[PDB]
Design a protein around this ligand. Sequence first.
Ligand code: NA
Ligand code: NA
Ligand code: NA
Ligand code: NA
Ligand code: NA
Ligand code: NA
Lengths: 321, 321, 321, 321, 321, 321
Amino acid sequence: MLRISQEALTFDDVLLIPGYSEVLPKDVSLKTRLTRGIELNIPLVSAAMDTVTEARLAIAMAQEGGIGIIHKNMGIEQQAAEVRKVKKHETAKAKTYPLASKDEQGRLRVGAAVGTGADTGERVAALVAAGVDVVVVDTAHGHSKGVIERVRWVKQTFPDVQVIGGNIATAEAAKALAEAGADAVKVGIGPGSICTTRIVAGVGVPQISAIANVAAALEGTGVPLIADGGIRFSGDLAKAMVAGAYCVMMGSMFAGTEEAPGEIELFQGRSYKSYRVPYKGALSAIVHQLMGGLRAAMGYTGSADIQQMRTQPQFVRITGA
Amino acid sequence: MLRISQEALTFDDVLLIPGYSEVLPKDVSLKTRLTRGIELNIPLVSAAMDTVTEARLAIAMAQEGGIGIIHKNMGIEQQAAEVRKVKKHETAKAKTYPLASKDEQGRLRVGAAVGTGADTGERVAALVAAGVDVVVVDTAHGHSKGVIERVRWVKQTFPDVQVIGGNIATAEAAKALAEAGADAVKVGIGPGSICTTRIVAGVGVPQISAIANVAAALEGTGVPLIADGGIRFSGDLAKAMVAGAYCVMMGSMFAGTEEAPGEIELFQGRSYKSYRVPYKGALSAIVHQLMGGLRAAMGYTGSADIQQMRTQPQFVRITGA
Amino acid sequence: MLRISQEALTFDDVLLIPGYSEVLPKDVSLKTRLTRGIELNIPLVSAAMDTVTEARLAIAMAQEGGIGIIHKNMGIEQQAAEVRKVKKHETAKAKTYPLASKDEQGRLRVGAAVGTGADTGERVAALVAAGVDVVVVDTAHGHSKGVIERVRWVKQTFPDVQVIGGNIATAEAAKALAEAGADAVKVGIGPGSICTTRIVAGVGVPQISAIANVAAALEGTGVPLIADGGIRFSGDLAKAMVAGAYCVMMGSMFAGTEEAPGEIELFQGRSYKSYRVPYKGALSAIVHQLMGGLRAAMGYTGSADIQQMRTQPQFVRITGA
Amino acid sequence: MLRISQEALTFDDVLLIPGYSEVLPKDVSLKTRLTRGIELNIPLVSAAMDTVTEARLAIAMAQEGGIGIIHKNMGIEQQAAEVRKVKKHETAKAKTYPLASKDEQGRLRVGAAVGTGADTGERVAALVAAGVDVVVVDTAHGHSKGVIERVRWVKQTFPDVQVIGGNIATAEAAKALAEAGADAVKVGIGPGSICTTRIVAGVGVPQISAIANVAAALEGTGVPLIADGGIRFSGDLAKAMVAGAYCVMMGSMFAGTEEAPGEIELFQGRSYKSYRVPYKGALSAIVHQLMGGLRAAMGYTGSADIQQMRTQPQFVRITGA
Amino acid sequence: MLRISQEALTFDDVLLIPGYSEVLPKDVSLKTRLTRGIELNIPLVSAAMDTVTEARLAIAMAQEGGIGIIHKNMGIEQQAAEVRKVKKHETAKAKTYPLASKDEQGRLRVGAAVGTGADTGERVAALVAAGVDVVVVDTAHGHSKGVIERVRWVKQTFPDVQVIGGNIATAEAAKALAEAGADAVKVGIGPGSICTTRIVAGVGVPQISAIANVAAALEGTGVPLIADGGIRFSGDLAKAMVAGAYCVMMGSMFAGTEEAPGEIELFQGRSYKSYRVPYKGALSAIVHQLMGGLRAAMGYTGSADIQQMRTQPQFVRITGA
Amino acid sequence: MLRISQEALTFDDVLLIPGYSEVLPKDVSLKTRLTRGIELNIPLVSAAMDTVTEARLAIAMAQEGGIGIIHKNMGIEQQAAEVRKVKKHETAKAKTYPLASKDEQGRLRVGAAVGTGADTGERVAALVAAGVDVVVVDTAHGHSKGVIERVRWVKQTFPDVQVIGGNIATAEAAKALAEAGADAVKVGIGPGSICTTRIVAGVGVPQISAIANVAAALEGTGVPLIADGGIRFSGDLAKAMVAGAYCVMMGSMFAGTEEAPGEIELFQGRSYKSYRVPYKGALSAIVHQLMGGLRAAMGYTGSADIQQMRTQPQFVRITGA
Ligand code: NA
Ligand code: NA
Ligand code: NA
Ligand code: NA
Ligand code: NA
Ligand code: NA
């Protein structure tokens, strides 16, 4: 008698099935897209969190072949200044980053988040003027009048900038954002078992089904979808891609790295970052783990590139046992 | 080979799906009904428990826009006296409660519980004479000859008073109580995983399915249903409404508040209520949490009012994982 | 591709649904049958375990209106002597046991277990000569040539004695034992999640489905089935009856009672029985709990007697959550 | 919307159903095959792990009626020398091993593992020259060009030696290996809930379904399949056989035995093997437990031999509860 | 600079030193005195606690050769009635208690407690009229005007009854009570590490030193001292005697016995006494343990009787280690 | 060879010895002094902590008969304003506080803390002008040039105000502060086992010996000493007085009371104070516990008033055991 739409699956509900393979993990291609107009060499984005992405980590992310989204928990001038640092960054003498995400002028790519408040227009304008590549209209409920209208306003006001809208979790929301002119959508509403959205509001969609529903809705449109939340280890990342994601956004896993905000401190005979989270060392080692696991899964499933990984492998569904 | 009626779901089995929204949580309407004849400004009732509802908390509940049901674990004269205090309460000078549940004479509304024992008739008469708004025929098994007959006797003897019958958990029981003339039904038999009904008798219906089965049975009759049990946080409350409940009854969550029975004492360097349960401070802060979470869910699902919340949003079913 | 017969349910998978009731728990009838020819006033049997049933507990069990099965972990002469004590027991002056299970000569009823070894024939003969009411051919795998042949031999050699065969867990095994002439069957192979049969051999049938499959197979034959294992509290007992059991056998729950074998000793400032298990006091208090819970379930489901309890109420199936 | 092939079951999801039995556990036959051309008296193989199988344990395994696969984590000359020790081993005076796995010259049988690296050809040649009975092309992903080609190369280069290919987990992979000329396949990709393949790559197939899918694919071909992983106790072993396995490979359960590599040391007042794992005493006691449990399951299901055990008994599927 | 009287030792601070022995534990004498005028066959008293001593346990205590002190947490008439039951108790036919504590008329001996409130005089009179052997003026601080005056009043008003005063913990208090005419003193103020006297008031004397200080003060006076508190096992009891105690009072160790107040109930599958404490079975088994341990210590120290045990053996003092 | 001054004792090292008593706890006198010129009706001071003492709690403290010291973790104007609120507070109509600490104009007494920084002079002046009764020169190391000079400056600049200097822990420091003109001293350097002074600097004096050393040094001078730290329950408070303290300062035990700073919030279904610490309800209940325990100890030791409590009772020293 309940109005139940479907059973929805999370990462722990499924496993990838091995398939005939003739391309080794070291030889697969990880190239993909963030948005209609922005290509990435690896399917990885850093979250717009004040513990994760300011200019320093955004620069590292772009150097690795992904991209960072600078957070908005700061003044407009300050956020614009973080964007400028990335766009103006010049490669260290004696270092080479051949995977680096760059715009046509050869500058490192960067994103920045905005919300829907009364100073949003002013914030977007400052970010665009600072040379931002993509504006992320980033809210708790993207399938809403306010977000959809803000996405339209950005596309109308600044036609030359890429725009991401989110967060969403349904086919209908994906279509609405696409129609509003989003160049990509970000997927994740209550994706984790422990999130506050579930406990406070009783709301959420398990992330594997959320991703797959949004992927089917956007199939053949050219609009990428970004998976945002619920991913705990590299195995989950591979599952997200096979569910249909074009790339994955990481947050707290990147907090506490050298490039992330905060300062290293001694605590309990041990290094932490203080603003405390465990110090994690260089971002590059985490990226290596994540992308090594993805490469392994591509080898197991016989996927030679991301387009094959997203569309060809199958899951088995498993039990609690 | 087993006689299995259906699979029955509890709160943890389901999540609300986000929907297109254009009304913010702060702007939704929470108005609803307790019974055919009694409207509430918020969907919240306090339980007829001796740790929860006497006059002081009943007054606070009505001031918040809900209602309290005074417990029956006391003498008839005493319970009647608690009802009288509520009906005679005059608003503090310099305070305003614009949401307050009031009868046509402008007196705060109140309920009181009775059972089915030999002095029930006398107890009901005293409560009615004290000015009670609703009599709750409140038993462990409402789908029984004794309860159904008592509900009929109250409707026959005191036609001008509202009557709630319970507790029930099935479509057939809802219809039987409606036919007996109940102005609302209360839903919950073994709703919690930890309840004694399940352990001692092996009996129970998971509350999400119990609510939805009773809602379908009463659809189009004008008889409200009250959800009673199994609700641990605000997210569960929202799920109960979407399953079809008109309002929700809270018990132990309200015990230990300032307005609840008992006296504050120091225990282990910390405040408790003694008769011990943790002291919780003012009832209003709990109500704020519960209704804030409900408002959040209404925003997420795009429900502008309770009637939409009860009938329009969908669930996903999830796994243990 | 697996050869899966069915999904099988255990007690924790299901709950009883409340039904229209007009007979109170105190007023329901608990009368039932152990075998074609033996009626019990309560649906309770004590297990043939050396920690549970010798003459003293068998006498108490019969006085309560059930029956005990004397264990076979002793010499033939000794086991026969235990049977004789029960048959010769004379009611204490000034005590009355109006529910007592008695044969036509007015002697307390008793059972005794045998296996299939080389001295089984001699053991059966001694038990029968001692006046046993029912012989329980009691093995780990009753659906076997050895057990079926022993059941036939008992029916052929001693036509005037009742015979129970077990243990079984399938419809086919029930039919085979019935055909061999069993007056009842005992159900339970790997019924518990923790049993050695599951861990060592990978073998078992969850007890709710085992009971229901055996009940359907024996429907209309007049052959009772006894549920043996997996029952942890009174709620499980009620579920076993509704699944189709005629009565339930308890083992370790009865160990450590005053009437059970062993001697009380002080251990860790606390009473135990030593041969150690916690001392549990008088058997009657455990029986009261078990039968009180069954009565409660009968009231909830509106079952006026055991025949209605076995055939009329329904379950809901529930999730892990 | 997800590409889900099937629900896949693990050992804990299923139980064996008892069946009519007239052959006791002590009397069943355990004879089976490792490969097209190699018969075993018990369905047990030791893993090619450096903590498990060198010559000493391989000799014990063959004496018990199974076989060991010598690991490849050593130089080619060294691995060849381990094979030679087994082939040249002469039975101790005054000992008799009537179950022993022997070739036609009466020498104990032995296997050895190889991978796919650049010195594989040389390694295979040395093993064959040392008199190995079976070469195990043993990789993490057997359904790959490299493994399939290596299996073909072994069959072409050394037509008189048996070859096992693995590991696989699907019907398609089984067919590919059979076509490449494998004399058996080894089954197990991410079979355990805790394995690194699942966590790092998100890849795996629950072992009960993996076994059954491979069994169906190879039905009527004469190609055996070996179950490799996920088996924790003897009950799991029996389930693997009924799922379709011809024999089972054990690894870490055999580590720490007297015959396994490593040296006994005192640690925390207790014996360990150091290279540390608990000392387990003689291999024969573990084999006895495993085969005793299998015999018990064969008795319960009424399977007189392995061919009946693999093809006749049924499972029930059970819940988390 | 602190005013420290001495270091005070508790039971855990000391051990008894073995001495030359030629009398076995079974052959030592346990005879002693409760008061100037009352001899006991064992050095054991039951506490005046409402969970420990009413008539039933007092009778058992006297039968064992000790004595019970009936508690005062009841009406005066009720307490007098408990005393009367003991004095009027006639030995069961076919039982013999050759150690029994009896007065000159051959009636079982019994004590009863009083405090210092306004109805104390009336309470004492009722107890004496009921035939009590000893009145225990029993307070938290016996070295006080109120207690000393009450002890004098009892000795003056009822010269033929024995009187115990307590509780005390110093030489000065012992002398004051002796001077007031106490026939014995009871020792124990904050004796346990966990008592409320220490936590609330910061007051207490470790029991081994309290006993020894009181013993020295009363040496040569003929006034016994009773040790009351801090004794956890039989070893402590022996230490208390060697420290100078004439007998030992037990409280909570006796609660939960068959003879103690309360009724047996099933709780968590296990027997308790409810008023809950663990059921302990018959008092006699506890007494046997306590006196067996005392006998063992007497053997080890070569003490042939209580007078030697109290005056001859030595302790070693030990460290925390 | 170490330079060890003495063994130093903490509260857990000692217990109070009971003494002859003829004054009941309810009848003892708790009157004492804070400073040469300020008398208190109870020996209790609240700490100058920002979680403990602002005007609201200072007013409650003075009403109870003690005094509060307003903290200095705020601007000078703000701290002066808190002092003014206390001095200007007028007793609620219909309340009577007969124990209240008042100055000669009948205004509630209050203290305030200062340190030694560059704005200290200005801070002291503002406090004095606001009508403060006592200035507490409150530092981590009072036996220092800076503190001693500041104490002199306050006595010189404002001769009519009382001054407390601290913290100290030795006889020499007490004499130095007395000579500088302190009207009282505050005792406590590393008094707790868990304090940072001990862990970081290795510095501290166990509080019982610190108190007694300071008491002996100030004997006959008329200068009170205040015990500050290490006191966990009322029993410790009594021990501090007997060690020689005139009154005791409490900190964190008072944090979280209604009168203390912070605001009540719901957290984990339970009331806390947020700025989080457990909500403790009204200050008066804590004071009642502390002073009830002190009264109990005075009764036990036979101390009729504080002067007797400080000078007459004795301790026993106890072991870890
Ligand atoms: Na492919
Ligand atoms: Na809507
Ligand atoms: Na019925
Ligand atoms: Na068969
Ligand atoms: Na001696
Ligand atoms: Na005194």
